Design a protein around this ligand. Sequence first.
Ligand SMILES: [Mg+2]
Lengths: 79, 100, 235, 321, 147, 50
Amino acid sequence: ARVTVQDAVEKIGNRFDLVLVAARRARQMQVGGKDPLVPEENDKTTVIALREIEEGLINNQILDVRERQEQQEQEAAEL
Amino acid sequence: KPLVGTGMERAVAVDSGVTAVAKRGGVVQYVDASRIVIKVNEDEMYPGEAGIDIYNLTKYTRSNQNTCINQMPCVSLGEPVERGDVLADGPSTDLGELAL
Amino acid sequence: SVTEFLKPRLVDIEQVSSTHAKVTLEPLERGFGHTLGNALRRILLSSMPGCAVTEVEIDGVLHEYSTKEGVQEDILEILLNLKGLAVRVQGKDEVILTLNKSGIGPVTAADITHDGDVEIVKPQHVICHLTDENASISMRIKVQRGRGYVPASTRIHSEEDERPIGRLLVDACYSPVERIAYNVEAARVEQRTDLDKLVIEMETNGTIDPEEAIRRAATILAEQLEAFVDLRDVR
Amino acid sequence: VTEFLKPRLVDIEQVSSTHAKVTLEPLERGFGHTLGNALRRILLSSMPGCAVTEVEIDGVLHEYSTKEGVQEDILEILLNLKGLAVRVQGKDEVILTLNKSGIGPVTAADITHDGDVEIVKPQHVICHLTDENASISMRIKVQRGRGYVPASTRIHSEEDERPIGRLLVDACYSPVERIAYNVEAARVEQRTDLDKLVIEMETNGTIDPEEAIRRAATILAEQLEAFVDLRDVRQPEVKEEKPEFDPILLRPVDDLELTVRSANCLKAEAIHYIGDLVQRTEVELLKTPNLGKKSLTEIKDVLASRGLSLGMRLENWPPAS
Amino acid sequence: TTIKAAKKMVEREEAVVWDILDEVIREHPVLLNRAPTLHRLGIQAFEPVLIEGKAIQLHPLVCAAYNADFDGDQMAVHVPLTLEAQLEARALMMSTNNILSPANGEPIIVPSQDVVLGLYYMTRDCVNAKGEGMVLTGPKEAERLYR
Amino acid sequence: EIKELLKLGDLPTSGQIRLYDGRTGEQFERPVTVGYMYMLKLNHLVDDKM
Ligand SMILES: [Mg+2]
């Protein structure tokens, strides 16, 4: 149950890229099957995405470097 | 019955033929939920083929707006009634009065 | 003294009429008057053991939206009048009574074939008007004791019990009480002041007993209170 | 079914150890309102506790006066005294001395170590004191009452007499500071909405909030004991005493729901009671004229729905007619 | 497991499936929409809670923004149906994220007649009442004295 | 005329009767007016709109 996201607007430049990176994170988490890093409350993926965006441990650049390193390590394991 | 009426609720109840009106005054002969048999007064009685009057109360039937219109009896046995008096209040009527 | 005070007690069960009654409780120290009054009024109006009609079975008519040659009123008003009456059962909780009558006249509740356990609180309640002579009314009336009120349509559990056409359902709005007013006034004590005596007047259907209803309400309130009288971090 | 439901609490928040939030779920359609109202009206007015009752200053006889040594007025000292939470033993009323001066602000811990009583918050400041030669003291007197006591009922006490002890200050005998009950919707597995109670409360720290709730519940139970069913179920004793046959036999023959012709020809044979018809066979029924296939089958089928048999052997007849 | 049995269980409406419906709407907001939409706030996002009656309960403090009095106005509800759309509805068109009118910086969530009348009656001080000119030490004391 | 009609019955002439709350069980200040008004049910049922 998320009621206020004003601090998220304070964190990211605007709401467009905010909801874009939130959608990418939710796609990589829910239909991606990966693991989160924030304690949940038996909820959906949207509100935990908003929570981990509000904290600051996940953003555009962090998602970019994470997916890049994942692709690199997958290519390395592929040999 | 609407408590705060305007008086017109009587006339508007008898002008529209939604309720059963007494065509000829007489005495109540037979009361039923559907059929009302009224014995005609011998003064108002017709000269030939004398007899009685029989009103068929319109039972539950679909109106033009899917609303159930029905008429209920409002007279007791042998209750004397005059010409033009009400006999069975239809939908939204009570004792000959528009009661929406 | 100032702590561990007294308790109220029933001191009158005076019935001003058959249905309208008035009980008095005393004594109450202070503030307990309005508290207990509102509490008991809410508990009484909320739910009490009721024994109204649930469904009927008329052999002549098929569905409640029809007529019956011989009777004056409509079947819907018959159902409403049957809802208006009240009965009292002691042994069993559910019972099927029979209403059978003939001949011209105002057929009231007294014409039913009563049983030993089932009792009619008021027979003067008119049910129908058998206007025609050769008109014989004969029907079954199901009455089951319940708690509170339940609508007619939402009371269904399957679709096989309603297959008999004669089974006509009515909303079992069983409620012995109809209105519960209360007030407080000065009480009597050998040497003290500001003691409050409470008075509850109740206009009821006449089925349940005033003291019995007050005691049942007090029991329900005491149970709901003991539900957390010693509440802890329980799950 | 004359069987109500019981709540199952899931949230008991004890934030700050003096400001509690309890939930109760589920309840009936209206039990939450009455429960919250009763609990509020009890905790606010009818809740025996203890607080300050009387103040004693050296020579300031009037609230419209001041005394050097403090940076406030006597009304501020009275307001601070109004919150001095302190609990007492079985004693009904006890005085406490605050014969102390100095420099720093005076707090609640400055009261003498009266072992019979104990203050909740000794660190609670009583009055910010002037930092120079502030030579001023006072005395307090605490009691135990029912609930909030205004100054009006003590104006009569002021009207009675006037020794040095006659001062004026309210007494919040109720140990709870604030209470708020609320109702919300609850979702039973099939029922859509029922009353869910939410009780927020805050006390002076004399007792635990849940302890105050339990005490209010116990006092309400003590009040209601005089009418609770006289017992758990009011009848843990069952017996039985019934006659052998049924009173249907004494009922007239017209209670059989038969045709008028059949009933007439049955009454014509002096058969006006079911008990006088059950103890005989139908070999004599056909002897009476106008007793054909309709009347006989109707009579023998009505008793079939009643279980009794046409033709029996009983000697107890007729009791008592 | 299969779709046919699931549809049968849903249409039968067993008492067990209610928790599934409660969980699936716990964090899945919908879009309330007024029939005439003139400004942005004609469509808003709201987290639904399950209730009875075939009527849609609405917050009183938003109808003024919706220009929808309670004289019989009919409104519609839409579902995002997409994770991206759900996140967007929670982010941009959320009720809490829309309180300043798109026309003026003034709050569109201005209180309506009932609440302001209640508060005006509450704060309208008289000259003589119970507790005239007494003294208190906290708002909780005032709440106790009032209740 | 309405004043004298109310005076005929036991009802107060002011036409404003005090009320008591059902939940809190206390008295409402500012004695409100209560009466018996004729009301109509429109043909805009929710069962035909949902
Ligand atoms: Mg409108």
